[PDB]
Design a binder for this molecule. Structure first.
Ligand SMILES: CCCCCCCCCCCCCCCCCC(=O)OC[C@H](COP(=O)([O-])OCC(O)COP(=O)([O-])OC[C@@H](COC(=O)CCCCCCCCCCCCCCCCC)OC(=O)CCCCCCCCCCCCCCCCC)OC(=O)CCCCCCCCCCCCCCCCC
Ligand SMILES: CCCCCCCCCCCCCCCCCC(=O)OC[C@H](COP(=O)([O-])OCC(O)COP(=O)([O-])OC[C@@H](COC(=O)CCCCCCCCCCCCCCCCC)OC(=O)CCCCCCCCCCCCCCCCC)OC(=O)CCCCCCCCCCCCCCCCC
Ligand code: BCB
Ligand SMILES: C/C=C1/c2cc3[nH]c4c(c3C)C(=O)[C@H](C(=O)OC)c4c3nc(cc4[nH]c(cc(n2)[C@@H]1C)c(C(C)=O)c4C)[C@@H](C)[C@@H]3CCC(=O)OC/C=C(\C)CCC[C@H](C)CCC[C@H](C)CCCC(C)C
Ligand SMILES: C/C=C1/c2cc3[nH]c4c(c3C)C(=O)[C@H](C(=O)OC)c4c3nc(cc4[nH]c(cc(n2)[C@@H]1C)c(C(C)=O)c4C)[C@@H](C)[C@@H]3CCC(=O)OC/C=C(\C)CCC[C@H](C)CCC[C@H](C)CCCC(C)C
Ligand SMILES: COC1=C(OC)C(=O)C(C/C=C(\C)CC/C=C(\C)CC/C=C(\C)CC/C=C(\C)CC/C=C(\C)CC/C=C(\C)CC/C=C(\C)CCC=C(C)C)=C(C)C1=O
Ligand SMILES: COC1=C(OC)C(=O)C(C/C=C(\C)CC/C=C(\C)CC/C=C(\C)CC/C=C(\C)CC/C=C(\C)CC/C=C(\C)CC/C=C(\C)CCC=C(C)C)=C(C)C1=O
Ligand SMILES: CC(C)=CCC/C(C)=C/CC/C(C)=C/CC/C(C)=C/CC/C(C)=C/CC/C(C)=C/CC/C(C)=C/CC1=C(C)C(=O)c2ccccc2C1=O
Ligand SMILES: CC(C)=CCC/C(C)=C/C=C/C(C)=C/C=C/C(C)=C/C=C\C=C(C)\C=C\C=C(/C)CC/C=C(\C)CCCC(C)C
Ligand SMILES: CCCCCCCCCCCCO[C@@H]1O[C@H](CO)[C@@H](O[C@H]2O[C@H](CO)[C@@H](O)[C@H](O)[C@H]2O)[C@H](O)[C@H]1O
Ligand SMILES: [Fe+3]
Ligand SMILES: [Mg+2]
Lengths: 50, 260, 331, 36, 273, 50, 50, 36, 50, 50, 50, 50, 50, 50
């Protein structure tokens, strides 16, 4: 390969990488909901806004 | 009342000024000067008055040796214990008893290799390319290298000495294959069956010929000889360059004398 | 004269060879080398091949975006007139906010475009630093260049980002423009009371002049021993010839001490690094902990004083305005 | 949403909350599905 | 007292004047006739600085200032406390700089080296002469020169700059600054490249000149070369002062207006108004 | 049809990294340009509204 | 070939690349609708606009 | 659209909304099909 | 060939390239009409315009 | 009929890269230019209008 | 799916380094950008409202 | 009638690249020059007449 | 030849190049007429013009 | 006439490129210089007449 990884090393890294990325994104989602409960940051359209 | 105040007359910038000086002088004296002492140290006193520490111990001003691992082979240390002592029996005599007194050559300094003609005890190996071939070679041994189109080809030009007398004929150029740079002229010297290399820096080259202020024509005969015909060792490079450099001061006696 | 030290009379040509292989990215070393003749007189004639890489592309993309933003706002400054853009180029500029917004993101018309350009330039410098560092690593070289470069980038961040953060105002930052960024130099010096009295300005200038001295001295030294092969510095480092013995002796006999062919490069690295380090420290101190460098020097007894030549003239506004209005908003 | 006295009371029913969640949740789902 | 390789190089000859009279070393220093004159000027000038500082208003090291005469004195010798000490120290400084340069010539002749270093040292000497002698001659008195003091010569630089309303717009200044920045950056690059090649890492091999060329051909698409970088460094460092001298000598003798207005040659071309 | 043959000439690594950088640039431009307006800034208190 | 990829690697990469590009574009479409509900950013032609 | 009070009530029927959707959706379709 | 592509590769690339360029220009046309419906950007000659 | 032969000399990769950069630059110029006007700015509150 | 084959061409070590740098940059930009506002600053005493 | 022989010496690629850049520079000059006028500016609200 | 085109490649490129150039110029002519209908850019000589 | 022998020595490509650049520079100078005058500016509303 160009990177020097074997097929099995590539598969192992891929599984760990996708797992880590999905866990990171999911905790981001949960954390963003908690923050919204602290500070709902997208305000509703105010009066006179167009 | 104020940002940056530490007392009535103590502020952060005042302390940072002294901190900056501390940084500068710690780096200079504790590190940079120690690095500066990786060649030529420990110092020697051939005409000293007192006993110094032995040259073979780490005497305190000496940095601990570092190891360079060479690209094509073994290792060198700095300070280098093998280059610590110089053993050549220089042909020089004292003009006065003290070390600060200059030495005078005992005869033919350019051939002896003293003063401006001194050469260093470099390794007797051919400097190489990163591919392992000899780096500096004549164009006859490197047909894949050539003079750029439209540039003056000096082969066949007459070589004149410092006295205006014709000394020889350019036979070849020596190219540095790593750098793609011409470094030597090979000269067939008139009056012998012998070629002499000359660093290209000592040559003033025109379409008429090449002129060498460094040495007289007759002195081209005594240029140090390459052991091999189409390669040159590092020590050979030092010897050949130092011969012409010594001629800069020794070719004629007048060159060693002052104006007034 | 050794005319080789002035220029190269007889240029050499050879095979088109791939350079030393990198640990990665040889696939991304692209371009057919071209040989331009006048360049070979003062240096190497060969242009290319160039390495692409991911970080190089990132540097180019962010830098081109920042250049596009700056140039477009300059063009808008002349109302898009091309001839007048050409005439007035040096005077044109993309400016940080002129009103006081603190560190809040300013409107597009009064500093938002400046901020976007500054961010794009910062990201391009980050990518190019990655390129410098990782190319050094790929070829099995130390990363000294990358750390010198990092210090330079840090100074750029100090004058563009960090000082505005520390005093709390984007209006203090450097505008983009030929003459405008020099205008910033003068305005910034005046606001903080004569940068000539800032000790780190003095340190940075001392090291910049020292770089001038050191590169003049080292370049002239190497040229002076060029007939002994002094320019082949790596071999001299590993197997010292007469060129660097002569260089060391010249400096030793001149001023009583000398470097080695390796350590003179440590001196050069140190001086260039210290230009940027001293500048960064000075900028981070300015405004946050020192308001007027001249008055700071007067407080610490360093500033010279001179007799009046024309009669001394008291402040005609003494005690007529509130001194808080000098640097602070009245309300 | 807005409660009595016109003060915001955050909740999972706020419509705007589904701008970030949608931006974050939607890729997180198909990233988890396409590349496995 | 000698470097381990030094003794073979300490030979007689190469002096410009003096011959064997002063051709000797004191410790590591080579002396020569111009070493003797350099020590004379250095000792005299520093001692005159010391005494003149003692008579000034402040002895704080950074507040000491030895100033040239008033403009009314023209080129005449001034009373010592009113510019005469500055004149004597200026003469001592010139003698010291020229002695140092000529001793460098003698040292390089002794070592079979090119004279590149004393010739390069000529450039800052020439800039000092432009500042203290040539421009004062064109302006009509020693009073136009800069004073001697860590912070006071900065005051002179500052006020000289603002006498032309913005010195940043001086084209000679723009060239000089560009060379200063280019030289500092190029020195950083060159020191870093040499150190990176000689110091790759932990137990890694010293690399080669081909690695030097490869690094910069990768990064910027061009490598200037090993000898050429030293040539370029000398060129940029020299051109700092070589091109600055034009702006300096022009300011006043060839241009009395603000420097920004000088660019009217471009801005006011009638074709584009 | 034969569109996959694009990756026989156009080098997927360079394309993927270039796209990552390019889309980062555009996303940063949009987010910060919007934050540089009164009407479409979602972080700050609403400004510029009578 | 020019990129070092085999034909089957080209087909696999093309499949994944097109899938990811379309998914990213489609989520961008959905997100832009949601943002329009938050802030309808192309205002109607104002009164005196010409 | 504009409510009875002149307030802004965004909806899928807003005409201007179909500028971005049109710019985004149209390529998204044919990119999916031209390189299918 | 100078590019290294073969005749069949060049034909396939030309077909797809022309199709892509035409589709891009056609969506440009449609989008410009939609934008005109939002902002009719070339106003008629005003009252005193000469 | 023989237009495909263009890709035997004109190097598809270079053309695609150049078009990508070129069209990006043109698009950025147009969007920025419109944003710099009062009449056609669609981000900020309408101004410049009697 | 051959997604793991991505790691045969994309050098996992450089990818992880780049992602660490990228996410650090994004996180710092967001945290400090929020701190630069009145509404969403969570360190300082609340400003910007009556 | 022998004009085609021009492409035996003038490198179609070089001419195409030069024409692309040249016509682009001319078009940018004209569009931006027109936008710098009051009379022929079509982006901004009409100026230069009462 | 110096460019690498054969005789027939040169002829075919010349034919397509000329046809493209002519079509570009013709659409420029038509577009200039349409723009004139939008903005008659060369006004008649005004009253006091000499 | 033996004028054609000029092209045995003068390199038609050099002459064509030189003429292209030269005439472009002259034309740009003339057009933009005329646009810098009140009398002959054909883009803007007439200025500089009483
Ligand atoms: C006014 C001018 C005054 C000049 C006085 C000269 C006196 C020399 C002398 O007496 O030497 C006797 C001595 C007797 O020789 P010897 O008996 O044969 O040698 C005995 C040892 O075996 C050999 O010793 P060595 O070779 O190991 O010597 C190393 C060298 C060490 O030299 C250095 O460390 C040089 C430091 C460089 C400073 C770098 C400045 C740049 C960084 C900051 C930039 C600031 C920017 C703002 O000398 C010293 O150890 C320190 C000497 C202390 C006196 C310095 C005054 O000769 C020497 O040691 C020569 C070295 C003298 C070098 C002068 C350095 C001057 C630095 C001033 C600039 C600093 C600005 C702040
Ligand atoms: C992109 C950028 C890329 C780079 C761009 C291009 C690069 C440009 C920069 C290149 C690097 C710099 C090149 C400088 C090279 C200078 C050089 O090679 O000198 C070695 C060369 C060493 O001579 P040699 O081969 O050992 O002579 C054989 C023996 O020494 C026997 O010698 P002798 O005893 O027959 O000599 C008697 C000598 C006796 O002369 C003296 O003793 C007086 C020397 C005065 C000290 C030096 C003052 C230099 C002042 C320069 C001021 C510079 C700034 C001024 C404003 C501009 O009288 C003369 O030779 C002429 C009198 C004046 C000579 C100076 O020095 C000279 O021969 C004079 C060269 C001066 C030419 C330039 C002067 C300016
Ligand atoms: C408000 C006024 C300003 C100003 C006023 C100004 C003037 C009037 C001049 C310059 C000049 C210069 N300015 Mg400028 N300056 C510069 C940088 C520079 C230099 C590149 C250049 C040359 C310096 C010089 O000639 O030193 C001279 C240094 C010399 C002569 C060194 C002599 C050394 C001597 C030979 C040996 C001495 C040895 C020691 C005595 C021995 C020590 C012993 C040891 C043992 C202790 C920068 C980068 C900036 C920025 C960042 O804005 C700037 C802003 C300004 N300058 C302000 C805008 N500056 C000069 C120039 O060239 O302008 C075109 C100049 O004339
Ligand atoms: C004390 C030490 C210093 C120091 C040190 C070091 N300095 C370094 C390094 C070190 C160690 C490196 O390792 C690095 C490098 O690689 O070296 C080869 C570098 C570098 N120092 C550069 C410029 C520099 N250093 C200055 C100053 C100091 N440096 C101080 C003095 C100054 C001053 C003073 O003005 C400047 C201008 C670049 C050449 C380079 C970064 C390129 C970059 O980050 O690219 C980022 C990429 C881009 C911006 C994309 C560019 C795209 C095109 C080409 C541009 C637009 C073209 C388009 C057609 C539009 C036209 C208009 C447009 C032209 C307007
Ligand atoms: C463009 C090229 C440049 C360049 C080049 C080179 N530079 C060289 C060489 C080369 C090539 C050498 O070969 C020579 C040397 O040996 O290097 C180790 C040297 C040297 N560069 C020094 C200082 C230096 N270079 C500066 C600038 C550049 N250098 C530019 C950048 C600056 C700036 C800008 O401020 C400074 C301060 C000394 C350290 C040293 C001289 C020793 C001397 O001359 O000994 C003899 C004299 C003394 C030791 C002291 C004399 C004291 C007098 C009698 C009394 C004081 C008078 C004085 C007027 C008071 C001033 C007060 C002040 C507050 C205003
Ligand atoms: C404190 O010490 C330091 C300095 O001194 C101050 C520095 O100057 C520097 C450099 C420069 C700065 C700090 C100033 C500018 C830096 C900022 C704004 C933060 C750091 C940001 C960067 C260094 C670069 C910013 C780049 C981005 C955000 C775009 C990232 C996208 C990339 C890298 C390509 C996308 C590709 C992927 C994510 C995976 C595939 C990647 C590859 C195949 C190659 C990537 C290679 C590497 C080596 C990471 C560093 C790193 C440092 O540690
Ligand atoms: C060890 O010797 C050295 C070299 O040669 C091996 C260098 O090339 C270099 C690099 C120096 C240069 C490439 C010339 C200075 C210009 C630099 C660094 C950037 C300017 C931009 C370019 C050269 C891009 C040119 C592309 C066309 C150094 C620093 C060096 O020390
Ligand atoms: C009896 C009698 C008359 C005696 C008189 C004897 C006599 C003349 C004594 C002189 C005493 C005096 C005046 C001493 C002052 C000496 C001076 C000027 C010291 C200043 C030192 C300073 C501040 C230098 C600034 C530059 C600087 C930071 C240098 C440090 C780095 C070094 C050592 C650079 C020199 C150096 C360079 C530039 C190389 O390229 C090179 C290449 C290969 C090997 C070595 C070297 C090398 O050593
Ligand atoms: C915390 C948050 C929310 C954000 C932080 C963002 C951030 C990190 C910002 C950083 C900003 C920084 C570091 C800014 C620094 C700016 C500095 C130091 C600038 C200094 C000098 C700039 C100069 C001299 C620029 C000159 C530029 C030019 C001449 C550009 C010319 C451009 C052209 C000709 C292109 C024309 C293009 C055409 C289409 C019109
Ligand atoms: C804050 C992070 C700073 C930027 C980080 C960028 C890192 C660059 C990624 C490449 C790292 C690996 O680089 C590689 O390492 C091995 C380790 O022995 C070396 O192998 C020798 C290679 O010559 C080197 O190229
Ligand atoms: Fe060096
Ligand atoms: Mg106009």
């Amino acid at each position: 390969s160009l990177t020097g990884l074997t097929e099995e090393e590539a598969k192992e890294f891929h599984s760990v990488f996708v797992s880590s990325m999905v866990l990171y994104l999911a905790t981001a989602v949960i954390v963003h909901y908690l923050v919204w409960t602290a500070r709902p940051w997208i305000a509703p359209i105010p009066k006179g806004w167009v | 009342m104020y940002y940056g105040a530490l007392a009535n007359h103590l502020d952060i910038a005042q302390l940072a000024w002294y901190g900056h000086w501390l940084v500068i002088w710690t780096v200079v004296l504790f590190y940079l000067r120690r690095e500066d002492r990786r060649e030529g140290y420990p110092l020697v006193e051939p005409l000293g008055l007192v006993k110094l520490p032995s040259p073979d111990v780490q005497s305190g001003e000496l940095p601990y040796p570092k190891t360079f691992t060479l690209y094509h082979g073994g290792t060198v240390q700095a300070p280098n214990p093998n280059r610590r002592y110089e053993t050549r029996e220089l042909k020089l005599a004292q003009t006065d008893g003290f070390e600060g007194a200059p030495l005078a050559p005992t005869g033919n300094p350019m051939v002896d290799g003293v003063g401006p003609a001194s050469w260093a005890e470099r390794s007797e190996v051919v400097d190489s390319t990163f591919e392992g071939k000899a780096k500096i070679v004549p164009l006859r041994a490197a047909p894949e290298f050539y003079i750029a189109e439209g540039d003056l080809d000096p082969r066949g030009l007459p070589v004149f000495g410092a006295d205006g007398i014709e000394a020889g004929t350019v036979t070849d150029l020596w190219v540095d294959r790593s750098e793609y740079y011409f470094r030597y002229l090979e000269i067939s010297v008139a009056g012998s069956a012998r070629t002499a290399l000359m660093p290209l820096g000592f040559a003033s080259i025109t379409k008429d010929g090449v002129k060498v202020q460094a040495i007289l024509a007759s002195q081209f005969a005594n240029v140090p000889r390459l052991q091999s015909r189409d390669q040159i060792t590092l020590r050979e490079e030092d010897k050949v360059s130092a011969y012409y450099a010594g001629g800069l001061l020794y070719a004629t006696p007048e060159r060693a004398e002052p104006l007034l | 004269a050794d005319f080789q030290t002035i220029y190269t009379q007889i240029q050499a040509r050879g095979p088109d060879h791939f350079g030393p292989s990198g640990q990665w990215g040889d696939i991304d070393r692209v371009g057919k080398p071209i040989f331009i003749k006048w360049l070979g007189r003062i240096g190497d004639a060969q242009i290319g091949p160039v390495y692409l890489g991911a970080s190089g592309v990132g540097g180019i993309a962010f830098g081109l975006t920042a250049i596009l933003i700056i140039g477009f706002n300059m063009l808008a400054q002349v109302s898009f007139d091309p001839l007048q853009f050409f005439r007035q180029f040096f005077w044109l500029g993309l400016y940080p906010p002129k009103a006081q917004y603190g560190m809040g993101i300013p409107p597009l018309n009064d500093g938002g475009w400046w901020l976007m350009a500054g961010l794009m330039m910062t990201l391009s410098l980050g990518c190019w630093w990655i390129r410098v560092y990782s190319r050094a690593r790929a070829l099995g070289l130390g990363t000294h260049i990358a750390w010198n470069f990092a210090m330079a980038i840090f100074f750029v961040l100090c004058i563009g980002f960090f000082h505005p953060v520390l005093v709390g105002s984007w209006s203090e930052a450097v505008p983009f423009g030929i003459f405008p960024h020099l205008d910033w130099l003068t305005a910034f010096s005046m606001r903080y009371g004569n940068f000539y009295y800032c000790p780190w300005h003095g340190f940075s200038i001392g090291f910049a002049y020292g770089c001038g001295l050191l590169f003049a001295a080292h370049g002239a030294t190497i040229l002076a021993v060029a007939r002994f092969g002094g320019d082949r510095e790596i071999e001299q480092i590993t197997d010292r010839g007469t060129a660097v013995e002569r260089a060391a002796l010249f400096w030793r006999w001149t001023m009583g001490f000398n470097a080695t062919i390796e350590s003179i490069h440590r001196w050069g690295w140190f001086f260039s690094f210290m230009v940027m380090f001293s500048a960064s420290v000075g900028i981070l101190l300015t405004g946050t902990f020192v308001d007027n460098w001249y008055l700071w020097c007067v407080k610490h007894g360093a500033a010279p004083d001179y007799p009046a030549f024309l009669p001394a003239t008291p402040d005609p506004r003494a005690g007529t305005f509130d001194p808080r209005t000098l640097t602070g908003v009245p309300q | 949403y807005f409660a009595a006295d016109g003060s915001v009371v955050p909740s999972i029913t706020d419509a705007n909350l589904w701008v970030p969640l949608g931006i974050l949740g939607i890729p997180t789902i198909w990233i988890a599905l396409l590349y496995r | 007292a000698l470097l381990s390789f030094e003794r073979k190089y300490r030979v007689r000859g190469g002096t410009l004047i003096g011959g064997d009279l002063f051709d000797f070393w004191v410790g590591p220093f080579y002396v020569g006739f111009f070493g003797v004159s350099a020590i004379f000027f250095i000792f005299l000038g520093v001692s005159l600085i010391g005494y003149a500082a003692s008579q000034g208003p402040s002895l704080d090291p950074f507040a000491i200032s030895i100033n040239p005469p008033d403009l009314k004195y023209g080129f005449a010798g001034a009373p010592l406390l009113e510019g005469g000490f500055w004149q004597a120290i200026t003469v001592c400084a010139i003698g010291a700089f020229i002695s140092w340069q000529l001793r460098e010539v003698e040292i390089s002749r002794k070592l079979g080296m090119g004279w590149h270093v004393p010739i390069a040292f000529g450039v800052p000497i020439f800039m000092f002469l432009v500042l203290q002698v040539f421009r004062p001659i064109l302006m009509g008195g020693w009073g136009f020169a800069f004073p001697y003091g860590i912070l006071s010569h900065l005051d002179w630089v500052n006020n000289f700059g603002f006498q032309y309303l913005n010195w940043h717009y001086n084209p000679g200044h723009m060239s000089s600054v560009s060379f200063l920045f280019a030289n500092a950056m190029a020195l950083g690059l060159h020191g870093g490249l040499i150190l990176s090649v000689a110091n790759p890492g932990d137990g890694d091999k010293v690399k080669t000149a081909e690695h030097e060329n490869a690094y910069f051909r990768d990064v910027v698409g061009y490598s200037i070369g090993a000898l050429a970088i030293h040539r370029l460094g000398l060129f940029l460092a020299s051109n700092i002062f070589l091109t600055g001298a034009f702006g300096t000598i022009a300011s006043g003798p060839f241009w009395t207006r603000g420097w920004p207005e000088w660019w009217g040659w471009w801005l006011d071309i009638p074709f584009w108004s | 049809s034969a569109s996959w043959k694009l990756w026989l000439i156009l080098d997927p690594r360079r394309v993927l990294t270039a796209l990552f950088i390019y889309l980062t640039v555009i996303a940063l431009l949009i987010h910060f340009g919007l934050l540089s307006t009164n009407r479409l800034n979602w972080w700050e208190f609403q400004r510029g509204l009578p």
